[PDB]
């Protein structure tokens, strides 16, 4: 509540901390979370779209084949960027306006 930031790695007894209403927990992004995904150059609206996360092994961003066209992307070496919304308002906007099916 006071703004102090408890780091759970360097707190000797991180697991034994009761939580109190009003606090925040920076929890790992999990399956089903909403993120913005894009490629450059961003030539039109459809180059930044909302996606639901699926946390999975290996180090590449994996995405459906039919979504390549709006990104003008292919898998010969392209790199793409992912932005994680950090608020309820931003999540609502990505989910309700920007999502891939809505596009």
């Amino acid at each position: 509540d006071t703004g102090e930031r408890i780091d759970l790695r360097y707190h000797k007894r991180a697991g034994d901390i009761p939580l109190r209403y009003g606090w925040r927990v920076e929890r790992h992004i999990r399956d089903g979370d909403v993120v913005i995904f894009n490629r450059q150059p961003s030539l039109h609206k459809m180059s930044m779209m909302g996606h639901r996360i699926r946390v999975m092994p290996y180090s590449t961003f994996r995405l459906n084949l039919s979504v390549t066209s709006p990104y003008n992307a292919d898998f010969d070496g392209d790199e793409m960027n992912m932005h994680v919304p950090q608020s309820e308002e931003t999540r609502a906007e990505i989910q309700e306006i920007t999502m891939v099916p809505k596009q």
Binding site: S59, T60, F61, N64, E79, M82, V84
Partner: protein
């Protein structure tokens, strides 16, 4: 403003033009195109894409 036409530039001791305020504000890398209309952002990942 160190890009005045018809004047000698205020060089650096390393033989480089000085970074004037106009140069700080000007250009793609200036404040208003490199730091205000665009930024480096937190909470962003990047990597190769596969199918």
């Amino acid at each position: 403003d160190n890009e005045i036409a018809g004047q000698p530039q205020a060089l650096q001791k390393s033989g480089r033009p000085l970074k004037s305020i106009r140069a700080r504000l000007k250009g793609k890398e200036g404040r208003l195109r490199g730091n205000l209309m665009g930024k480096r952002v937190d909470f962003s990942a990047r990597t190769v894409i596969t199918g």
